[PDB]
UniProtKB/Swiss-Prot annotation, chain A:
Tissue-specificity statement: Expression is limited to epithelial cells. Expressed in the kidney (brush border of proximal tubule), pancreas, liver, and small intestine. Expressed at a lower level in the adrenal cortex, testis and stomach. Overexpressed in breast, renal and lung carcinomas.
Compartmental location: Membrane; Cell membrane
Modified residues (Phosphoserine): S20, S64
Parent-protein start and end of this portion: 132 to 215 of 519
Name this protein carries in UniProt: Na(+)/H(+) exchange regulatory cofactor NHE-RF3
UniProt superkingdom: Eukaryota
Biological role stated in the UniProt entry: A scaffold protein that connects plasma membrane proteins and regulatory components, regulating their surface expression in epithelial cells apical domains. May be involved in the coordination of a diverse range of regulatory processes for ion transport and second messenger cascades. In complex with NHERF1, may cluster proteins that are functionally dependent in a mutual fashion and modulate the trafficking and the activity of the associated membrane proteins. May play a role in the cellular mechanisms associated with multidrug resistance through its interaction with ABCC2 and PDZK1IP1.
Domain description: The PDZ 2 and 3 domains seem to be involved in the interaction with SLC26A3. Interaction with the C-terminus of CFTR could be mediated through independent binding of PDZ 1, 3 and 4 domains.
Gene it is expressed from: PDZK1
Curated annotation (Swiss-Prot), chain B:
Shown residues within the full chain: 132 to 213 of 519
Protein name, per record: Na(+)/H(+) exchange regulatory cofactor NHE-RF3
Compartments it resides in: Membrane; Cell membrane
Phosphoserine modified-residue sites: S15, S53
Description of its domains: The PDZ 2 and 3 domains seem to be involved in the interaction with SLC26A3.
Function as written in the Swiss-Prot or TrEMBL entry: A scaffold protein that connects plasma membrane proteins and regulatory components, regulating their surface expression in epithelial cells apical domains. May be involved in the coordination of a diverse range of regulatory processes for ion transport and second messenger cascades. In complex with NHERF1, may cluster proteins that are functionally dependent in a mutual fashion and modulate the trafficking and the activity of the associated membrane proteins. May play a role in the cellular mechanisms associated with multidrug resistance through its interaction with ABCC2 and PDZK1IP1.
Family: Belongs to the NHER family.
Summary of the tissues where the protein is detected: Expression is limited to epithelial cells. Expressed in the kidney (brush border of proximal tubule), pancreas, liver, and small intestine. Expressed at a lower level in the adrenal cortex, testis and stomach. Overexpressed in breast, renal and lung carcinomas.
């Protein structure tokens, strides 16, 4: 659930990075999904429903699905992501103990 | 196994539930089109709706108006 | 709908209140195992409808916190627990 993002460096192997990018209804930017077991992404620390903040140092928080795909395709055989998890990417939560 | 159902309305006598059939009104058009409770919608008017949302499938049915066909059985994603 | 009458044990009721950005309502969370709230039948993600007979459906996190604080060592909740289109 952390407010400490992950830096994940992926090198393509066997023709695939082992992730898919999706959009989510009424949410900005793009998200990881379909993290293949033992694939490059899972091995690099990528998590399902991670939210992409940066691709190779470039902010993608406000980018379209297509923009991010292009950015990742332009990267070729290696790519770096700055990622925050599903819980960080959700709406803020206030909790008071009683 | 899949059935083709062609419904002519001014109501159809079924409800969509999340997509699935439900509220099949006794002796109505959907019931007598062959529609059964909890049918899974595979297609509407030839278009697959297996991965469709509730809203998407609702608008597709409203869009064909007074007549509709279902194939029944009793978001962007890019892969890298 | 459950009506729950809670009495503090060791200075705690064994629940926390939660609100989420984008979501209307105040909710129960963090129900301490075998605490007061758990023993009164309170459930995680219960939506608060009333506190001591005042509706709090439109109320802020902080309004509801104060309302619970103000009844002291006992408090009552009205609670409810956490698509079809016709053609």
């Amino acid at each position: 659930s952390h407010m400490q993002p992950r830096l994940c460096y992926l090198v393509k192997e066997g023709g695939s990075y082992g992730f898919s990018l999706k959009t989510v209804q009424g949410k900005k930017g793009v998200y990881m999904t379909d993290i293949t077991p033992q694939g490059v992404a899972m091995r690099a620390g990528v998590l399902a429903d991670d939210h992409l903040i940066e691709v190779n140092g470039e902010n993608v928080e406000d980018a379209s699905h297509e923009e991010v795909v292009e950015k990742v395709k332009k990267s070729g055989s290696r790519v770096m992501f700055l990622l925050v998890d599903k819980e960080a990417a959700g709406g803020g939560i206030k909790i008071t103990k009683f």
